[PDB]
Design a protein around this ligand. Structure first.
Ligand SMILES: [Cl-]
Ligand SMILES: [Mg+2]
Ligand SMILES: [Mg+2]
Ligand SMILES: [Mg+2]
Ligand SMILES: [Mg+2]
Lengths: 195, 226, 244, 243, 250, 241, 231, 204, 196
């Protein structure tokens, strides 16, 4: 899969993920949702090798949902990201590694803070104000470095994200067919249906 | 690396340089390549340093347990057999080249051991990148019924040849002397022919030279009680 | 063959009881009494040693109170050797959780894990159960201060105050009489020692026959601190509370 | 009491009663013998004709191991077959590694250790057979007899089964009367006689004689069955001696 | 040929007793007396060399064993069970500690490992408990000198002084009267010899007594020179002559 | 009463199966003796061939374990051969792994440890044998080490095993009480064998022919057994003084 | 008594009671007869029904084109042993291009049954088998007992009342052995033999089961109206 | 492709008079791309400090592994692990993965609580110990650090002088390495106080 | 390496050079390639020094255990144990071994085991890199039932030529004589054999 972006603002985390699924010669789909809800206040977007991406995401989703039922409690975003990192770090020395890069956007209900975690297929974890995987950061980070403020509203975060996507649409060779955008805050997860 | 071993009148002696190099850079200028196996059994290690050290420690541990079990002082042939069988099992993947020497109830012994598990018996041996330089000295001056004073001289001369003429070897000379009916004497830094000269200048900075963003105290203590 | 000699440790009686569990509990009833009391600002663990000897080196001795991590401790009643096998397993589970999630293990999760291990020995394997009852004293950010007990059956329950070992019937009546919900640690310390002093089979309760510990939120600057009491410190608290 | 209910339990005497009970199964079986001769060994066995419906010469009891060892046994016949199957595996692996065919003393210990192993655990039953076996190796002729306990010794003559006392007495006469030794062809004749004499203990049913032999001069050191004219000559000799 | 005892041979009786552990303790009680005394600057462990025959060479039978250079052990009960425990204890000191940390384990942790092995024979399938109580004396840098007892159950307790086996009840009463916290090692050896004389019937000399100490570092026993940090073993077994010298000042 | 059937503790702290294995030891009704010279270790054992049908050359309770080590067994032959095969396997493995010949006392310890396991583990029975190992060890010199079903072992100056062991033991005890040394002060092994046979004759009160005895001799770098004609030469020398 | 709790235990007189109890299951089973000449070998089996609504339990199982058996006792144990025979016959054909000798088939069944009599946990097989076959040495008939004992015979019978048939075959021995190149007469002799073991019941069309193998005859089973000829 | 230089970064440790110093840069990258300027490479277990350079997933994994092991050590030993003992634990742990190693360059720094002796050590990826008196270097600019340290270092520096020496060694080494920089941290460690200082440096 | 074994009237003689090389460097100039697996069963080793030493040590263990159980093994038995190890592990071994031994029954026997792990019983055998240069010489000069002195000369002259032409061979010529009389070691120095 191609472009996955993340930006943590004042009171929410915004994840933007491309809609295209290309199998070599043809674009098979232009409405693909590259994300799974792990818990009510934690969302994970993903990109990497075909098959492995969804298999990994759903496997993580199942384990976090299992934890939620057992303890009657939602794990913090930090705890979920550490669990995800360990599974990827375990994977890299396997017989056949998961080639999957993820962003984990969550709202910590205890601390009342949005949190964004970037984890690559090796199990390299970093907490960031904004992040990306693959070539997405090469185009967008100069704009984010310039315009980003920690006290941005959700609407300002979306406007900065539009500028990032516009720059991607201008300079990237591949047609990624636009992005699905989702917001993670104190009220949970919702999709921005017009972008 | 230059390591050497040779036998004399009523003993055996080991020699080694003290330089560890990864690629072209000197990682360590004073490392110990003469390894302890038993009180009177020692091992010079060449090749991959971690492997040589690890293999001597494992066999040294097993030799100690064997010695306790049998109520006998360990033999060099036991250390030799255990090392070669271990190294053979790993088909050279443990890249240890060793010179094993010691004294035991049987007498004094000197063996070499290669990474694939072949062993040799010798009166004088050398291993490592400096082996050819060291062996030139041993072939020139080694003789039968050497005295201890002559043997230490020859062993250190063999290691020096490696130090000066091999880029892989350098720094100081370590020696270990194992004589019959005596405690083994481990002579670390037996020779020190490569002390650095005094520098031209002092590079100590004025205080406040470095720019600092933040200062904080790190709490390294257990949680306190009130 | 071998069948002849098998006691069959994991079977029901005609009444639907697990023989070996019931007999393990009988063993535990002869062990030194351990008491746990939970307060608003901390937990107390008090326990009586059965050594009863002058030459025993008390300051380096540990038979009753063990540390599982920085936030959780246990009081032991039963076979000490059996308890140490389980304690080491619990210590590993806590560190596994910390490695996986980067957060200290919640108290109940640790308790459930150990209790599940005990349960397994009663249902399969043909081995004798662990002759151990634990009092778990711990803290986490979800439920705060918590007391639990587990027994050889693998059943565990939560408590405000509880006893295990000898004279638990008598001990639980005394705790039920004087415990209140708004109680503080200093009051709970006094209750635990007074209860042991009345239920003890010994002629008098002294410092050399006790192990004592507190978990108090009230480490400098809002952190939780475990305090395993030294012999001299047990002697002082006995004089303070007016028992010696 | 209860010491006899489980194999590998020592009684207060220091006895393994389950092994002693296996001996009773051996004592209940048909008579089998072995005779050591000058350059080889002869084996013979009594086969009870339970009925006319048994096909003559078909239910062969003596078994070969490798090409040079003969085995015969008395007691539980399936147990004897199981032991010979093991013996064949032991002889095959010996020859695989060391090239030379298994020597007889070596082979004896392979069977011995295996039988002895079945007295070490309560999860197995001891062997209900005594096995007489032997042959020719590089050091000459060897005859052995192996009991349910795992015990074995070398023999000049050996006998086991229901008629063992009778047979043993006859073997003891041959040893005394022939210190210089007995020829292979003589031993075949004498083996026939001894089985016929030992048949007084099983006199109710009639029987069938079966003989085999290994001899350096007569069989090139290979195990062979005595057949046809040589077998009939031995039967005639035996029939003449009883009358 | 299969091991079918996969079930516990030690089980709880209706009264809450673990029979096989109690019976193992009875075997320890029949065993020859051994003791341990802790001083300020050392520990002493001692026992009687009960020779089964005068033709036997009792020097070849070591009741007092080195476990590590700074830790020693003695027992009461079944000798063969002790010997195999010493083998396992020496090996576990290497595999679960020295090969990881590059140093010998402290006394309490090696004891913990021995205790674990003994506990497992009390719960695992198809085995009986060990019929020995051990007394383990040792030194380490951070804990100093220490003395531990280990029972068939796997339980262990630290002692200032104690005795186990035949005459342990009388011996422990003797040690309570004599022990204080200001004893030097030579005083503890003297008390050990006095205590042990009461439980010995026959000959009482260096050839019939086995005695070892955990004391000062012995660089003479190390076997090599040239490493300042290695100063030699604190465990030392007293000779037959060394014991007889102290029996004159008795 | 299943505490008498398997190796678990009785209420007295005893292992009855171990005690009964000791009784199996004397089932052969054979007495053995071992003594040490200056340069050698001699072991003698009674040889009884009750059946005339037996091949007397194959009747033996002395085993050549390795070149340097010999072993005599007191107990039934199946267990004797079980112990013999294992000791041979252990001696060969030792030499392969550690590069020198297995010492007599170390083999004894190893076999004793194996015997200890059968007293602790339920599924394995003890072997009903007492094993007496002999050698001239390269470090310790002449050596006798004996193992039993309890897993006990110890070194000996001299030893005796069998039904009449006490009579032999006391005879040997009395000799060493006179001489005040740990061995037979004699140069040749031939005379040490003559001592061994003489003191067994005195202790048991029976005369021996060449076929009534079995002899094993350990010297430096080899252990060997004497033939009937070697023993006969020994018996002639005894009678001639 | 005390020594019949498992197969691993000898009695004081050297008997294996579990094996003898397995032998008893065969005596309760329905009668089956085996007999042969030099050219052919025949099995005749009296099948048993549960009641008048039920089918008659099959007694004969084909193992190969040249071999097969009849059973008496526990039918599931016959299924296990016949399946093992099928595999050994098949192994011989696939690996060696060789038809398995009937004598060697008996040796394999003996050894398989033996292992169950010497080990803890298992039980003896509770079935008796009569194996017929035609191989390179002509016609053969075997009797298998679950003790392990396998016996080569001219004729025999096993099951309830089998002694009547076995006595008849003992008398007729000299006659039926000579029935060469005449399959119908050999079957007649087998049907006449099994009739000596009948009481109250007689041989009907769905009661009788016959099998035959011979020189130029593959192992074939006859049931139903195919055996009406011989009633 | 080379696992030890994908993420980049450096660690240096030095001894002084009654003190030790350990320092590291803050960069984490994906080759040319700078990803994080807050990736600290120094961790501590009681009073023992561990710096780790190399592949970042292994840096995180080994930290979590040694936290695990030193926590269990403390519970069993009833005391904090010492630098000398921890060094052997790092070496053991790395060598057990001999044929599938962690791609890292660890550095140990600390003061022995009983003797008061300053201690530093470095390792290769399979656990070979370099126990230097003077200084230890590690990471993608280890050559540059060797050059700085070998000239700038002198023995027995006071804590506040040692701070200047180690800081200037790190900074100028990092400025000659593409894959290091983006901030820096220096720990000054004394027997019972530890000061942590973030340095100001060029952000390219 | 230059190795050979030669049967003669009184028994067998094994012969070898003493050079061990790592490329063109002589790692050991006084190697003993004549190795003892039993009292009167020896072998000559060629190929991987690690492999042939590992094999020879295992064989020595097998024959020691054989001897404890079954008495003295034949030379054929020793060759068979060598073959079993070489043949079954042919994919992971580079070993060329000549086995030579003396029985009283069979007298002197020689077996050669080349790379594949096949066995060939021969009156004499040559092997190692230097043996290529003396196939012609050895074939022309070998006779059956030579004396001890003739056989020593034959081996000395043969290995002298092998050493002369092969860079991988050199040093001293070691020999081991196996007869009823016992085991005799011989050594021949360069100044002796070079002038032949
Ligand atoms: Cl052992
Ligand atoms: Mg047992
Ligand atoms: Mg830079
Ligand atoms: Mg830049
Ligand atoms: Mg040349």
């Amino acid at each position: 899969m191609d472009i996955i972006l993340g930006i943590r603002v004042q009171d929410s985390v915004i994840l933007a993920s491309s809609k295209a699924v290309t199998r070599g010669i043809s674009v098979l789909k232009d409405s693909d949702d590259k994300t799974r809800q792990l818990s009510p206040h934690t969302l994970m977007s993903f990109a990497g090798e075909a098959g492995d991406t969804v298999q990994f995401a759903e496997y993580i989703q199942a384990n976090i949902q299992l934890y939620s039922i057992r303890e009657d409690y939602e794990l913090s975003p930090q705890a979920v990201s550490s669990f995800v990192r360990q599974e990827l770090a375990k994977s890299i020395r396997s017989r056949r590694p998961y080639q999957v890069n993820v962003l984990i956007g969550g709202y910590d209900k205890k601390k009342n803070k949005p949190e964004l975690y970037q984890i690559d297929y090796l199990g390299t974890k970093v907490e960031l104000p904004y992040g990306a995987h693959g070539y997405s950061g090469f185009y967008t980070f100069s704009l984010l470095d310039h315009h980003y403020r920690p006290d941005m509203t959700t609407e300002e975060g979306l406007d900065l994200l539009k500028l990032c996507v516009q720059e991607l649409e201008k300079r990237m060779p591949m047609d990624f067919k636009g992005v699905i955008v989702k917001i993670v805050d104190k009220d949970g997860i919702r999709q921005v249906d017009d972008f | 690396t230059t390591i050497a071993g040779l036998v004399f009148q009523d003993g055996v002696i080991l020699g080694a340089d003290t330089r560890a190099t990864n690629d072209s850079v000197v990682a360590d200028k004073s490392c110990e390549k003469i390894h302890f196996i038993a009180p009177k059994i020692y091992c010079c290690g060449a090749g991959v340093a971690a492997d040589a050290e690890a293999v001597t420690q494992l066999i040294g541990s097993n030799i100690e347990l064997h010695s306790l079990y049998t109520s006998r002082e360990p033999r060099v042939v036991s250390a030799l057999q255990m090392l070669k069988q271990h190294l053979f099992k790993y088909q050279g993947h443990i890249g240890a080249y060793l010179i094993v020497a010691g004294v035991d109830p049987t007498g004094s012994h000197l063996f070499s051991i290669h990474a694939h598990g072949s062993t040799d018996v010798g009166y004088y041996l050398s291993l490592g990148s400096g082996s050819l330089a060291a062996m030139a000295v041993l072939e020139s001056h080694w003789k039968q019924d050497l005295t201890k004073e002559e043997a230490i001289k020859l062993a250190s001369d063999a290691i020096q040849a490696g130090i000066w003429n091999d880029l892989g070897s350098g720094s100081n000379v370590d020696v270990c002397v194992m004589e019959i009916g005596k405690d083994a004497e481990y002579l670390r830094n037996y020779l020190t022919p490569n002390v650095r000269e005094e520098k031209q200048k002092s590079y100590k900075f004025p205080r406040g030279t470095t720019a600092v963003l933040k200062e904080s105290i790190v709490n390294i203590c257990d949680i306190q009680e009130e | 063959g071998s069948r002849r000699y098998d006691s069959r440790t994991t079977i029901f009686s005609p009444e639907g009881r697990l023989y070996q569990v019931e007999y393990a509990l009988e063993s535990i009833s002869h062990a030194g009494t351990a008491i746990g009391i939970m307060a608003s600002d901390g937990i107390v663990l008090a326990a009586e040693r059965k050594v009863t000897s002058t030459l025993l080196e008390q300051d380096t001795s540990t038979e009753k109170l063990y540390k599982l991590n920085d936030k959780i401790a246990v009081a032991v009643a039963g076979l000490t050797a059996d308890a140490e096998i389980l304690i080491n397993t619990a210590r590993i589970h806590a560190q596994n959780y910390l490695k996986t999630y980067n957060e200290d293990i919640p108290v109940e999760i640790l308790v459930r894990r150990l209790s599940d291990i005990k349960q397994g020995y009663t249902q399969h394997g043909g081995l004798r159960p662990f002759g151990v009852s634990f009092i778990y004293a711990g803290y986490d950010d979800r439920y705060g201060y918590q007391l639990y007990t587990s027994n050889p059956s693998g059943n565990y329950t939560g408590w405000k105050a509880i006893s295990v070992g000898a004279n638990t019937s008598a001990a639980q009546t005394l705790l039920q009489m004087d415990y209140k919900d708004d109680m503080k640690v200093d009051d709970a310390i006094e209750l635990a020692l007074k209860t042991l002093s009345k239920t003890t089979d010994s002629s008098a309760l002294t410092y050399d026959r006790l192990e004592f510990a507190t978990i108090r939120k009230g480490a400098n600057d809002g952190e939780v601190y475990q305090k395993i009491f030294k012999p001299q410190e047990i002697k002082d608290i006995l004089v303070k509370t007016g028992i010696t | 009491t209860g010491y006899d209910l489980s194999n590998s339990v020592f009684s207060p005497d220091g006895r393994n009663f389950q092994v002693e009970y296996a001996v009773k199964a051996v004592e209940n079986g048909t008579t089998s013998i072995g005779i050591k001769c000058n350059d080889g060994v002869v084996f013979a066995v009594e086969k009870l004709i339970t009925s006319k419906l048994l096909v003559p010469q078909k239910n062969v009891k003596i078994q070969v191991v490798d090409r040079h060892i003969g085995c015969v046994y008395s007691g539980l016949i399936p147990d004897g077959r199981h032991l010979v199957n093991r013996g064949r595996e032991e002889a095959a692996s010996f020859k695989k590694l060391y090239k030379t065919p298994i020597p007889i003393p070596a082979f004896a210990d392979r069977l011995g250790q295996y039988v002895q192993a079945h007295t070490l655990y309560n999860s197995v039953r001891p062997f209900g057979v005594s096995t007489i076996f032997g042959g020719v190796d590089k050091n000459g002729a060897h005859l052995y007899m192996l009991e349910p306990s795992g015990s074995y010794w070398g023999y000049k003559g050996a006998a086991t089964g229901k008629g063992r006392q009778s047979a043993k007495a006859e073997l003891e006469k041959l040893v005394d009367h022939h210190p210089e030794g007995l020829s292979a062809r003589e031993a075949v004749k004498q083996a026939a006689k001894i089985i016929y004499l030992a048949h007084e203990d099983n006199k109710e049913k009639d029987f069938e004689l079966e003989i085999s032999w290994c001899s350096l001069s007569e069989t090139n050191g290979l195990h062979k069955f005595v057949k046809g004219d040589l077998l009939q000559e031995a039967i005639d000799f035996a029939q003449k001696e009883i009358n | 040929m299969t091991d079918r005892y996969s079930f516990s041979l030690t089980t709880f009786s209706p009264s809450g007793k673990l029979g096989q552990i109690d019976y193992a303790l009875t075997a320890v009680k029949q065993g020859v007396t051994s003791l341990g005394i802790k001083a300020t600057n050392g520990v002493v462990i001692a026992t009687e060399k009960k020779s089964s025959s005068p033709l036997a060479m009792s020097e070849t039978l070591s009741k007092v064993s080195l476990l590590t250079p700074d830790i020693g052990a003695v027992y009461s009960g079944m000798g063969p069970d002790y010997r195999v425990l010493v083998d396992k204890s020496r090996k576990v000191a290497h595999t679960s500690y020295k090969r990881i940390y590059g140093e010998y384990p402290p006394t309490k942790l090696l004891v913990s490992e021995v205790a674990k092995i003994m506990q497992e024979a009390t719960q695992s399938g198809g085995v009986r408990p060990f019929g020995v109580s051990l007394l383990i004396a040792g030194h380490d840098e951070f804990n100093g000198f220490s003395l531990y007892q280990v029972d068939p159950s796997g339980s262990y307790f630290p002692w200032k002084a104690t005795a186990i086996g035949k005459g342990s009840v009388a011996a422990k009463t003797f040690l309570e009267k004599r022990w204080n916290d200001e004893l030097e090692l030579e005083d503890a050896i003297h008390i050990a010899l006095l205590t042990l004389k009461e439980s010995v019937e026959g000959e009482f000399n260096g050839d019939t007594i086995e005695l070892a100490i955990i004391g000062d570092e012995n660089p003479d026993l190390l076997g090599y020179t040239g490493i300042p940090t290695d100063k030699g073993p604190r465990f030392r077994k007293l000779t037959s002559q060394e014991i007889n010298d102290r029996l004159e000042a008795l | 009463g299943y505490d008498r059937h398997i190796t678990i503790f009785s209420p007295e702290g005893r292992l009855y199966q171990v005690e009964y294995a000791f009784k199996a030891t004397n089932q052969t009704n054979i007495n053995s003796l071992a003594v040490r010279g200056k340069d050698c270790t001699v072991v003698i054992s009674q040889k009884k061939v009750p059946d005339k049908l037996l091949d007397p050359t194959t009747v033996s309770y002395i085993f050549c374990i390795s070149r340097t080590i010999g072993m005599v067994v007191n107990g039934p032959i199946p267990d004797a051969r079980n112990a013999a095969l294992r000791a041979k396997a252990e001696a060969a493995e030792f030499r392969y792994k550690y590069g020198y010949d297995m010492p007599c006392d170390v083999l004894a310890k190893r076999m004793a440890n194996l015997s200890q396991i059968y007293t602790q583990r339920a599924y394995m029975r003890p072997l009903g044998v007492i094993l007496t190992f002999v050698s001239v060890d390269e470090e310790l010199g002449p050596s006798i080490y004996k193992t039993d079903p309890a897993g006990y072992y110890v070194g000996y100056k001299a030893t005796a095993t069998g039904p009449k062991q006490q009579e032999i033991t006391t005879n040997l005890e009395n000799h060493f009480k006179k001489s005040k040394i740990d061995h037979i002060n004699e140069e040749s092994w031939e005379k040490v064998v003559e001592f061994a046979i003489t003191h067994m004759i005195d202790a048991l009160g029976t005369e021996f022919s060449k076929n009534d005895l079995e002899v094993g001799v350990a010297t430096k770098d080899k252990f060997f057994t004497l033939s009937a004609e070697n023993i006969e030469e020994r018996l002639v020398a005894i009678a001639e003084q | 008594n005390n020594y019949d709790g498992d197969t691993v235990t000898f009695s004081p007189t050297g008997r294996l009671f579990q094996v003898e109890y397995a032998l008893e299951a065969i005596k309760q089973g329905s009668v089956t007869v085996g007999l042969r000449s030099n050219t052919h070998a025949v099995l005749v089996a009296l099948k048993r029904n549960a009641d008048e609504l039920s089918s008659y339990q099959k007694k004969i199982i084909k193992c190969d084109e040249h071999m097969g058996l009849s059973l008496a006792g526990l039918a599931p144990d016959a299924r296990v042993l016949s399946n093992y025979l099928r595999q050994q016959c098949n192994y011989s054909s696939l690996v060696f291009n060789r038809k398995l000798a009937v004598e060697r088939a008996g040796h394999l069944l003996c050894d398989k049954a033996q292992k169950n009599t010497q080990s803890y946990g298992g039980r003896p097989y509770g079935v008796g088998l009569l194996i017929i076959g035609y191989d390179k040495s002509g016609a053969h008939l075997l009797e298998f007992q679950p003790s392990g004992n396998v016996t080569e015979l001219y004729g025999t019978a096993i099951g309830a009342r089998s002694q009547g048939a076995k006595t008849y075959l003992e008398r007729t021995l000299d006659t039926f052995i000579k029935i060469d190149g005449n399959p119908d007469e050999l079957i007649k002799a087998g049907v006449e033999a099994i009739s000596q073991s009948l009481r109250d019941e007689s041989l009907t069309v769905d009661n009788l089961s016959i099998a035959i193998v011979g020189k130029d005859t593959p192992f074939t089973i006859y049931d139903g109206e195919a055996v009406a000829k011989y009633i | 492709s080379d696992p030890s230089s994908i993420n980049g970064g450096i660690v240096v440790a030095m001894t002084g008079k009654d003190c030790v110093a350990i320092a590291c840069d803050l960069r984490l990258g994906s080759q040319s791309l700078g990803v994080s300027n807050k990736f600290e490479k120094i961790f501590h277990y009681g009073h023992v400090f561990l710096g780790i350079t190399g592949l970042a997933t292994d840096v995180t994994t080994l930290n979590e592994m040694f936290r695990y092991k030193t926590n269990l050590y403390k519970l069993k030993e009833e005391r904090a692990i010492e630098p000398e003992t921890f060094t052997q634990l790092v070496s053991s742990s790395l060598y057990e993965r001999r044929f599938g190693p962690y791609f890292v360059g660890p550095v140990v720094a600390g003061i022995n609580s009983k003797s008061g002796k300053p201690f530093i050590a470095g390792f290769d990826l399979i656990g070979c110990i370099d126990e230097a008196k003077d200084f230890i270097v590690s990471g993608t600019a280890s050559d540059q650090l060797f050059g700085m340290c070998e000239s700038l270092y002198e023995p027995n520096l006071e804590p506040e002088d040692l701070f200047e020496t180690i800081s200037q060694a790190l900074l100028n080494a990092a400025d000659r390495d593409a894959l290091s920089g983006w901030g820096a941290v220096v720990y000054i460690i004394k027997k019972d106080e530890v000061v942590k200082r973030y340095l100001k440096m060029r952000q390219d | 390496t230059s190795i050979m074994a030669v049967t003669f009237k009184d028994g067998v003689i094994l012969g070898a050079d003493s050079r061990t090389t790592t490329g063109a460097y002589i790692a050991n100039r006084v190697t003993d390639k004549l190795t003892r697996v039993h009292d009167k069963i020896w072998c000559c080793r060629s190929g991987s020094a690690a492999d042939t030493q590992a094999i020879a040590d295992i064989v020595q263990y097998h024959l020691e255990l054989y001897t404890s159980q079954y008495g003295t093994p034949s030379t054929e038995t020793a060759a068979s144990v060598f073959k079993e190890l070489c043949y079954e592990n042919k994919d992971n071994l580079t070993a060329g071994i000549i086995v030579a031994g003396y029985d009283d029954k069979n007298k002197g026997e020689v077996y050669t085991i080349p790379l594949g792990g096949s066995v060939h019983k021969l009156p004499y055998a040559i092997a190692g890199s230097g043996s290529t240069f003396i196939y012609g010489y050895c074939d022309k000069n070998f006779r059956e039932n030579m004396s001890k002195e003739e056989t020593v000369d034959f081996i000395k002259h043969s290995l002298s030529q092998a050493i002369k032409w092969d860079g991988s061979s050199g040093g001293v010529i070691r020999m081991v004589v196996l007869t009823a009389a016992g085991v005799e070691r011989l050594i021949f120095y360069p100044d002796e054999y070079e002038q032949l």
